[PDB]
Design an enzyme around this catalytic site. Structure first.
Site, PDB file in Angstrom:
ATOM      1  N   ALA A 191      -9.782 -11.951   9.068  1.00  0.00           N
ATOM      2  CA  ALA A 191      -8.552 -12.464   9.650  1.00  0.00           C
ATOM      3  C   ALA A 191      -7.693 -11.250   9.949  1.00  0.00           C
ATOM      4  O   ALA A 191      -7.363 -10.486   9.037  1.00  0.00           O
ATOM      5  CB  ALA A 191      -7.842 -13.408   8.680  1.00  0.00           C
ATOM      6  N   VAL A 197     -12.499 -14.572  11.939  1.00  0.00           N
ATOM      7  CA  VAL A 197     -13.943 -14.691  12.103  1.00  0.00           C
ATOM      8  C   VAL A 197     -14.449 -15.571  10.989  1.00  0.00           C
ATOM      9  O   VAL A 197     -14.169 -15.300   9.827  1.00  0.00           O
ATOM     10  CB  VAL A 197     -14.656 -13.350  11.992  1.00  0.00           C
ATOM     11  N   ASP A 302     -13.371   1.016  20.973  1.00  0.00           N
ATOM     12  CA  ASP A 302     -13.095   0.894  19.562  1.00  0.00           C
ATOM     13  C   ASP A 302     -14.365   1.030  18.701  1.00  0.00           C
ATOM     14  O   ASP A 302     -14.765   0.131  17.930  1.00  0.00           O
ATOM     15  CB  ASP A 302     -12.310  -0.380  19.270  1.00  0.00           C
TER      16      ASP A 302
HETATM   17  C1  LIG Z   1     -18.246 -14.304  16.531  1.00  0.00           C
HETATM   18  O1  LIG Z   1     -17.699 -13.161  17.173  1.00  0.00           O
HETATM   19  C2  LIG Z   1     -17.726 -11.970  16.544  1.00  0.00           C
HETATM   20  C3  LIG Z   1     -18.118 -11.897  15.204  1.00  0.00           C
HETATM   21  C4  LIG Z   1     -18.167 -10.676  14.549  1.00  0.00           C
HETATM   22  C5  LIG Z   1     -18.525 -10.632  13.110  1.00  0.00           C
HETATM   23  N1  LIG Z   1     -17.719 -10.200  12.110  1.00  0.00           N
HETATM   24  N2  LIG Z   1     -18.383 -10.491  10.929  1.00  0.00           N
HETATM   25  C6  LIG Z   1     -17.721  -9.961   9.684  1.00  0.00           C
HETATM   26  C7  LIG Z   1     -17.668  -8.431   9.722  1.00  0.00           C
HETATM   27  C8  LIG Z   1     -17.017  -7.876   8.450  1.00  0.00           C
HETATM   28  C9  LIG Z   1     -15.603  -8.441   8.263  1.00  0.00           C
HETATM   29  N3  LIG Z   1     -15.007  -7.891   7.012  1.00  0.00           N
HETATM   30  C10 LIG Z   1     -14.981  -8.890   5.955  1.00  0.00           C
HETATM   31  C11 LIG Z   1     -14.545  -8.220   4.649  1.00  0.00           C
HETATM   32  N4  LIG Z   1     -13.229  -7.564   4.920  1.00  0.00           N
HETATM   33  C12 LIG Z   1     -12.169  -7.747   4.113  1.00  0.00           C
HETATM   34  C13 LIG Z   1     -10.913  -6.971   4.465  1.00  0.00           C
HETATM   35  O2  LIG Z   1     -12.217  -8.483   3.152  1.00  0.00           O
HETATM   36  C14 LIG Z   1     -13.185  -6.636   6.064  1.00  0.00           C
HETATM   37  C15 LIG Z   1     -13.643  -7.444   7.261  1.00  0.00           C
HETATM   38  C16 LIG Z   1     -15.652  -9.983   8.236  1.00  0.00           C
HETATM   39  C17 LIG Z   1     -16.307 -10.526   9.524  1.00  0.00           C
HETATM   40  C18 LIG Z   1     -19.591 -10.945  11.151  1.00  0.00           C
HETATM   41  N5  LIG Z   1     -20.586 -11.344  10.324  1.00  0.00           N
HETATM   42  C19 LIG Z   1     -21.723 -11.866  10.829  1.00  0.00           C
HETATM   43  N6  LIG Z   1     -21.860 -12.065  12.169  1.00  0.00           N
HETATM   44  C20 LIG Z   1     -20.860 -11.701  13.019  1.00  0.00           C
HETATM   45  N7  LIG Z   1     -20.994 -11.892  14.337  1.00  0.00           N
HETATM   46  C21 LIG Z   1     -19.700 -11.140  12.509  1.00  0.00           C
HETATM   47  C22 LIG Z   1     -17.770  -9.528  15.211  1.00  0.00           C
HETATM   48  C23 LIG Z   1     -17.370  -9.610  16.558  1.00  0.00           C
HETATM   49  C24 LIG Z   1     -17.395 -10.847  17.225  1.00  0.00           C
HETATM   50  N8  LIG Z   1     -16.940 -10.961  18.550  1.00  0.00           N
HETATM   51  C25 LIG Z   1     -17.400 -10.187  19.530  1.00  0.00           C
HETATM   52  O3  LIG Z   1     -18.257  -9.334  19.339  1.00  0.00           O
HETATM   53  C26 LIG Z   1     -16.800 -10.347  20.903  1.00  0.00           C
HETATM   54  C27 LIG Z   1     -15.514 -10.819  21.182  1.00  0.00           C
HETATM   55  C28 LIG Z   1     -15.443 -10.773  22.553  1.00  0.00           C
HETATM   56  C29 LIG Z   1     -14.352 -11.146  23.336  1.00  0.00           C
HETATM   57  C30 LIG Z   1     -14.414 -11.035  24.739  1.00  0.00           C
HETATM   58  C31 LIG Z   1     -15.557 -10.558  25.341  1.00  0.00           C
HETATM   59  C32 LIG Z   1     -16.638 -10.204  24.549  1.00  0.00           C
HETATM   60  C33 LIG Z   1     -16.546 -10.311  23.135  1.00  0.00           C
HETATM   61  N9  LIG Z   1     -17.415 -10.037  22.124  1.00  0.00           N
HETATM   62  C34 LIG Z   1     -18.772  -9.514  22.297  1.00  0.00           C
END
Ligand SMILES: COc1cc(-c2nn([C@H]3CC[C@H](N4CCN(C(C)=O)CC4)CC3)c3ncnc(N)c23)ccc1NC(=O)c1cc2ccccc2n1C
Ligand SMILES: [Ca+2]
Length: 434
Positions: A191, A197, A302
């Site tokens: 978040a 997510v 990024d």
């Molecule tokens: C569903 O969409 C997305 C999802 C993710 C994603 N994040 N996480 C974790 C990573 C670690 C994190 N962590 C947790 C622990 N934590 C803390 C602080 O506790 C730190 C944070 C928690 C979340 C995942 N785990 C498994 N599968 C995944 N896909 C993800 C990333 C990017 C996108 N979106 C795009 O890629 C995208 C958007 C988009 C928009 C427009 C055009 C293209 C686009 N694209 C390709």
């Protein structure tokens, strides 16, 4: 009339697709990209099937030891993966000799450990194949049966073919835009300022990640335009972007990557057990995705370990490509901080910092320095000292990324090529054999 055969078991999970098993034969009725219409000679049912779960009758792809469209370095990664052993092998499409084939054999080296060796398979006209001119075979099948019963030349004799699981199943046909109803967002993973997510489910039988967007100044269609182009820029090393929910707030559905962010993984227990050769490999896979973006004249904006996701197999994937367009100063190049000039070369800089991140298991860049402190040090020509376990030669890759002048930073195509082959002299890539 065109008959194909099932390469794996598949249990249908949609309205009109067919269940079938390894060995099942089917008549192809349509080629509509990822999903084919087919009639099962087993069941007589007409329905849909994943095109990547089946191949044409007796074409090499039906063979257990054959792998289509595998580069030399994937062949190495696949072979080194859990569940293979000494003597594991495949024959595959020779990368640097179109229309030809190559043998990869898993071997062990006393003075280096587990390796993979590659042999060109030779064939002009006549028809048959050999790797050494004294030993001729009329088919690839005979070739392997020979080297299975004693190595006659080679660095290892062939045991069993390389193991392989089921391909990810392709996304549902004609399902780029999906109703929110189709999703159950089950657990909030992260978040930020921009959205959240979640781990979610699509239609009971598919695990997905969902990014949900807080409505910014970023317009609705404006956002979909970008998502739409991005979904076409598919690559193995970019997170698979499955579908979109068009109606505010926007949702974005990607594949679920079991190990989350690379940053999380390195910091994790299993992370910190990873040897350097593996850490460089991750580097190489990221370099490979960025080489693709590079070649298409895009820009990521990024790069950093927190925007790389890791599958359960430890494949690395770039996330957030394109999203950073629609919407952290320690990863960002001076031109980009000072004047806002983001190019592929500022991307190369951040890749530099990511290398440092990876090699130090997710420790913050510039530890102990604040943002302002950092911006100044850079100005005065400062760079991060080489950490302990960082090979000298990898330290120089980083240094090359952090050139002040952007045009003197390497291309990803180069970085990738060096990292892929970081432990192999060129002359050694393929094994000569007498
Ligand atoms: C569903 O969409 C997305 C999802 C993710 C994603 N994040 N996480 C974790 C990573 C670690 C994190 N962590 C947790 C622990 N934590 C803390 C602080 O506790 C730190 C944070 C928690 C979340 C995942 N785990 C498994 N599968 C995944 N896909 C993800 C990333 C990017 C996108 N979106 C795009 O890629 C995208 C958007 C988009 C928009 C427009 C055009 C293209 C686009 N694209 C390709
Ligand atoms: Ca050679």
């Amino acid at each position: 009339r065109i008959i194909v055969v099932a390469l794996y078991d598949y249990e249908a999970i949609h309205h009109e697709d067919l269940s079938f098993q390894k060995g099942d034969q089917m008549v192809v009725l349509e080629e509509s990209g990822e999903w084919w219409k087919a009639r099962s000679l087993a069941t007589r049912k007409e329905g849909y099937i994943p095109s990547n779960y089946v191949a044409r009758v007796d074409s090499l792809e039906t063979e257990e030891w054959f792998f289509k469209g595998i580069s030399r370095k994937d062949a190495e990664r696949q072979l080194l993966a859990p569940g293979n052993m000494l003597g594991s092998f495949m024959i595959r499409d020779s990368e640097t000799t179109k229309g030809s084939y190559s043998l990869s054999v898993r071997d062990y080296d006393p003075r280096q450990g587990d390796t993979v060796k590659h042999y060109k398979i030779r064939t002009l006209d006549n028809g048959g194949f050999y790797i050494s001119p004294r030993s001729t075979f009329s088919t690839l099948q005979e070739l392997v049966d020979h080297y299975k019963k004693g190595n006659d030349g080679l660095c290892q004799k062939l045991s069993v073919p390389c193991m392989s699981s089921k391909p990810q199943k392709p996304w549902e046909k004609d399902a780029w835009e999906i109703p929110r109803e189709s999703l159950k967002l089950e657990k909030k993973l992260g978040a930020g300022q921009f959205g959240e997510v979640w781990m979610a489910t699509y239609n009971k039988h598919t695990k997905v990640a969902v990014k949900t967007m807080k409505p910014g100044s970023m317009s609705v269609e404006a956002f979909l335009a970008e998502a739409n182009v991005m979904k076409t820029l598919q690559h193995d090393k970019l997170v698979k972007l499955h579908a979109v929910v068009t109606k505010e707030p926007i949702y974005i559905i990607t594949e679920f990557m079991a190990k989350g962010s690379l940053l999380d993984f390195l910091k994790s227990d299993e992370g910190s057990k990873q040897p350097l050769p593996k850490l460089i490999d991750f580097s190489a896979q990221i370099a490979e995705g960025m080489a693709f973006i590079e070649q298409r004249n895009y820009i990521h904006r990024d790069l950093r370990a927190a925007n790389i996701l890791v599958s359960a197999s430890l494949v690395c994937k770039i996330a957030d490509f394109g999203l950073a367009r629609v919407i952290p100063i320690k990863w960002t190049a001076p031109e980009a901080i000072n004047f806002g000039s983001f190019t592929i070369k500022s991307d190369v800089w951040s890749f530099g910092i990511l290398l440092m991140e990876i090699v130090t298991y997710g420790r913050i860049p510039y530890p102990g320095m604040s943002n302002p402190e950092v911006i100044r040090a850079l100005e005065r020509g400062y760079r991060m000292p080489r950490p302990e376990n960082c090979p000298e030669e990898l330290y120089n890759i980083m240094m090359r990324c952090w050139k002040n002048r952007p045009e003197e930073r390497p291309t990803f195509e180069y970085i990738q090529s060096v990292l892929d082959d970081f432990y192999t002299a060129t002359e050694s890539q393929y094994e000569e054999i007498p």
